Amino acid sequence: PEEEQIIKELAKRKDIVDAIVDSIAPAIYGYKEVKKGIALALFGGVSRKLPDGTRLRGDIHVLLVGDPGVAKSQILRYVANLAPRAIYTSXXXXXXXXXXXXXXXXXXXXXXXXXXXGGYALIDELDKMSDRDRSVIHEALEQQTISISKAGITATLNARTTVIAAANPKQGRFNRMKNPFEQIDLPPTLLSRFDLIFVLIDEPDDKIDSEVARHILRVRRGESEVVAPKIPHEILRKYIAYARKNIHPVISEEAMEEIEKYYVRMRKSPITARQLEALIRLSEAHARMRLSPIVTREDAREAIKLMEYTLKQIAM
Amino acid sequence: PEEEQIIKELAKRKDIVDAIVDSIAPAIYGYKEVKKGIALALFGGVSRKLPDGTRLRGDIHVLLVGDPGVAKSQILRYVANLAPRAIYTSXXXXXXXXXXXXXXXXXXXXXXXXXXXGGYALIDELDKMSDRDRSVIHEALEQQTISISKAGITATLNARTTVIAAANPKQGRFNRMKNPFEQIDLPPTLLSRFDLIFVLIDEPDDKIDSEVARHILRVRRGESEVVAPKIPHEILRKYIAYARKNIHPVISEEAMEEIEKYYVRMRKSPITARQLEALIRLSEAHARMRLSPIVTREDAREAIKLMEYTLKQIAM
Amino acid sequence: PEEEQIIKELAKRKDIVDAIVDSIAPAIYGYKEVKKGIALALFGGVSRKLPDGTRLRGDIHVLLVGDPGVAKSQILRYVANLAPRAIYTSXXXXXXXXXXXXXXXXXXXXXXXXXXXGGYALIDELDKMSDRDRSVIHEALEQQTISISKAGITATLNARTTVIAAANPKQGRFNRMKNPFEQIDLPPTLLSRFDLIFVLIDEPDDKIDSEVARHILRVRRGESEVVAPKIPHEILRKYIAYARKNIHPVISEEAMEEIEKYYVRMRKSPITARQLEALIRLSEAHARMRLSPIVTREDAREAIKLMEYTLKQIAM
Amino acid sequence: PEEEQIIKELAKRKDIVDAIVDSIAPAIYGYKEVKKGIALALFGGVSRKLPDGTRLRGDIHVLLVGDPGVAKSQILRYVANLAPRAIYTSXXXXXXXXXXXXXXXXXXXXXXXXXXXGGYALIDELDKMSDRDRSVIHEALEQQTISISKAGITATLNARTTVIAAANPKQGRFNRMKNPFEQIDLPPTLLSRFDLIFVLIDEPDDKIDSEVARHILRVRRGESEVVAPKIPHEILRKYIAYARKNIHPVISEEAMEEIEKYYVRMRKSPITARQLEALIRLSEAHARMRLSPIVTREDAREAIKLMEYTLKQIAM
Ligand SMILES: Nc1ncnc2c1ncn2[C@@H]1O[C@H](COP(=O)(O)OP(=O)(O)O)[C@@H](O)[C@H]1O
Ligand SMILES: Nc1ncnc2c1ncn2[C@@H]1O[C@H](COP(=O)(O)OP(=O)(O)O)[C@@H](O)[C@H]1O
Ligand SMILES: Nc1ncnc2c1ncn2[C@@H]1O[C@H](COP(=O)(O)OP(=O)(O)O)[C@@H](O)[C@H]1O
Ligand SMILES: Nc1ncnc2c1ncn2[C@@H]1O[C@H](COP(=O)(O)OP(=O)(O)O)[C@@H](O)[C@H]1O
Ligand SMILES: [Mg+2]
Ligand SMILES: [Mg+2]
Ligand SMILES: [Mg+2]
Ligand SMILES: [Mg+2]
């Protein structure tokens, strides 16, 4: 509770929104959106069921697909080292690290890739999952409920976790013209489950490279650099678990008008009505991220920003 | 019986017909007919056998086929949460929810998709039923009697339930010109079993979209909104089970003339004499829906209205 | 309804109770109790479930075990020719007769011996059932619910029928001193399921034999004799199906005292608290048999009479 | 919250403790302890984990083993109709009733007997579980965590439910001298998992029988009697779910002295140090049952009472 005191203070801050991303991964340089994306993903949408409106997921899934050597693997890793109930697990070898452990997890489930059925499961190399390990997630993302009835017994595991995953193209790189979506090795009906897909191509370019490298070296020498979180990870991890508890943003007519005015815009053009749902989740989380609990015109605004970005990137 | 008192009063109401639909699914916006359709389906036709006129089904089956993201899945779900003996079960995973349970069902049968052989079985994704799970229904809709003689034993299960199902095109979407009936993945001799098929395409259009979205948000925030039943679901569920008991509408010469005058109209034009039978069921149920028990010119009138609609929608 | 008129009149009759038995099997001579037993069995106990008092079977099962040539086979047969939904099926050969058929049965199930899962299944030669065909009944009598999950599928059939069965001793005859219950080839935990077991030994004796024979010949010559029902079987079959509908006897404090005063008596002495339950079923049915719907001191009285008889017969 | 108001008031009541049991099963007559036992079991022990003191189960398991016709089956059933997340499932046939359903359960798991991995699983006939269905529970009671790794995948289901089960002797009845514990068909290392085992033998005796019967009849006639809960089940079910939320009894030095003073007593004599743990759970729950949250000398007192009873019954 001495902590709750601090948190409120942080939120008070003017730039909190920005500070929170600059703390996701201080190491990796850039990727403001892929950071502000994961950021929301870690705060999640409202997720509050009603009887009349049955179930109501709020968890925000995020896919990271790109050419090799773009920091995907790296990034996920940094998230594990931050996110509370984080499970990193790359399609390669057996068993995984991630966790900072404390007598195991608070509630149910576990498995092969290693998912806690809550908790965010950072799945690197989702395109190299043995069709089995894939299937499960596919169900988990789709249904929101896994199930194993191998034997006379029938086991229905309740899936309630967030998935921040990475993935490479079926080819490795995809710079070609063809759509980034034919190049991924995942069944489209799975991809459609992510609320945001960051496509990461990598032209050469001097400027950026110079920056990126100079940056690596910097935060690569000794055991310290002026390149560490803008917010302590222990604080920021409490701050998260906190907002995913006491805050449940309600949509301001203010915002409402902004998101619909857009969904319709978005419609004019592989869009469905789902795009609207996920957009809602982002803007809800963007509020929770700062504790509101009112998705103001700004929140909703920001949400669409990030989304029209994920989108632009698809044109490559 | 303190209840029966209320019911009669409701029926007394001038707009009951309308109130009853605005209570099917207050959530989903629009689809007056797909609502007033399901409405009848929940009240069913006369269904009263005679020795001379052998068997006499009255149950009204309803199929909902459309492009994705049109509320099919959603809708069925809301029906389960209303309909008395409702069983929702979407072709995906194992076991299903629906029921509000009370020491199981009043009479016989059960199975794989999960049907109670009475009770309405809301079958979402009927186009993704394993050829086995399909077969059964096919028989159930066709015969009105299932059967399993796997072993020396022979089991003939009496099928007496209503089927309100959904389904997607073999392609996913079907906006093309080709007939909506070549695009469905169900054997025509099954489809022919539905008394009403609502074809749901989805052009974009601003107006409607704006409405739909604005609506979602509305009844999507907090745990309450001015968007709940025009009639309490507990009352309306008793009202149903009641009319499917004490009311057995007889056809008024009044109406008779209206439905035949039409069937013949309908004939001029993939129509049979079955179309006449089902039309009869609707108009009978539309009365029962308000308790008559006389299919007045209005009832019969309404019936054909809904039917010439289901029809218009086929031209797409 | 022109029928309902007659029925009420019959009940009005002073001797109805007696008339009803003299109509079970006019052929077979004697066995007043085995007749008045089956009689009750055909009318069944209350059988009305409550939420607080969960399930509530009322069906009365009856076992007939005796030396050969005592009319068991015969009797069951006559019952099939009377009882509404009757299924006769003797452990021998394949398929069975019984039914008077009419487009099959009103509700679910069917099988190997041939049972309709309602309807009374007259099972002759229950001691010669292939351990399989036995098992089922055993479950059916015990659970009140059968089940076949042979394959990936799981089938739980609701068992709701009456069982009036016959059976011979493991030896054929049992005149010996040893208890009639060690001589039957059925698992005691099955036998315990019957509400009445009529043990039929057959000493020679002139008097009785003379009667029995003289009787056979009588109702054995030509195609007619003064030995036909005291009540038309078509009437009496409606009368049954009627009382198993409109009558649901409630226990009069009057009777209550009689049955408990006895159960306790019965206790002093292979008795349990189940004996009390079944006794309750008889007395309830004995009322329904005449339509009450109040288990008067007489009904309850009669019930124990029949029961202390089934009992005396066990001493042989 | 209008409810929370009532609850507090009930607790205020002087006799609440007693009222709460007289509401478990008003039907079945007697068994004050088997009622006050189940009562505690429904309120559970503290169950609050710490890092230093690792895991900390609080759920109270209860076994009911006795001769047939003692109300075991019946009782469990009444509990299902009360307990919030209750699952009744008797080793017989397939699928089970219990639940009052509401879009399925709040959290994870499901299976063969049918358990929700929280919620109390009322398992009647635990001695007739197919060695498979047993195993699971055995693990569930022992580990507190189930697991299915059938295939490449590995599924660890978190077991966090209460088990109120019944069971018959390997012989059926056991009146003999031999210890009730050799007569049960369960592996001793399973039985040791129950916090209370009620052994139910059934001598005849007139007095009691007269009572029992008279009672049955009473609450067996019509659809009503002065034999219904001393507390409404809807209230009492909220009251439970409430105390299993806001109350977490701490042990008063007051009580502490009472339970240890006894454990040691208990030691003098198949006792371990586990007996102490479970005793602690009862007394904790007995407080929670009335909301304390301080296990006063009385609570602890009561706990040992019930326990020295379960014990006396073992001498038979
Ligand atoms: N934008 C970036 N910022 C910082 N480091 C980067 C960046 N892009 C690539 N790197 C470097 O690449 C390495 C990680 O490559 P990696 O993420 O594992 O490729 P992939 O995502 O395809 O598995 C790191 O050691 C890091 O120094
Ligand atoms: N007409 C509508 N009214 C209200 N919501 C709608 C409507 N159409 C689509 N939706 C939205 O779409 C979502 C449901 O899509 P869904 O019914 O599952 O597609 P499908 O029927 O193909 O499975 C809901 O969350 C809902 O908000
Ligand atoms: N009490 C009886 N009344 C009339 N006929 C009887 C009687 N007992 C035996 N019978 C005669 O026995 C024959 C039937 O024997 P049955 O019932 O088949 O022996 P079981 O019961 O062991 O199969 C009938 O033809 C009938 O004439
Ligand atoms: N103590 C009792 N109080 C009330 N009814 C009882 C009692 N004991 C036995 N019964 C009767 O026994 C029947 C239930 O027997 P049951 O519980 O199913 O035996 P078991 O527990 O071995 O399965 C009920 O219908 C009930 O009337
Ligand atoms: Mg990589
Ligand atoms: Mg769908
Ligand atoms: Mg024979
Ligand atoms: Mg039992």
Residue numbers in the entry:
A (entry chain A), B (entry chain B), C (entry chain O), D (entry chain P): 263 to 361, 729 to 746, 753 to 904, 919 to 965
Question: What do the authors say?
Answer:
Mcm2-7 complexes are loaded to encircle double-stranded DNA (dsDNA) via a ‘gate’ between Mcm2 and Mcm5 to yield a double hexamer that does not unwind DNA. These factors stimulate the Mcm2-7 ATPase and helicase and with Mcm2-7 form the CMG complex (Cdc45-Mcm2-7-GINS), the active replicative helicase.
We tested the DNA unwinding activity of PfMCMAAA to compare with that of the Sso-PfMCM chimera to explore interdomain communication. We found PfMCMAAA had a negligible unwinding activity. The inactivity of PfMCMAAA could result from attributes identified in the PfMCMAAA double-octamer crystal structure (see ‘Materials and methods’). Thus, although SsoMCMN does enhance the unwinding activity of PfMCMAAA, this could simply be due to enforcing a hexameric architecture or by disallowing the unusual h2i topology in favor of the canonical topology.
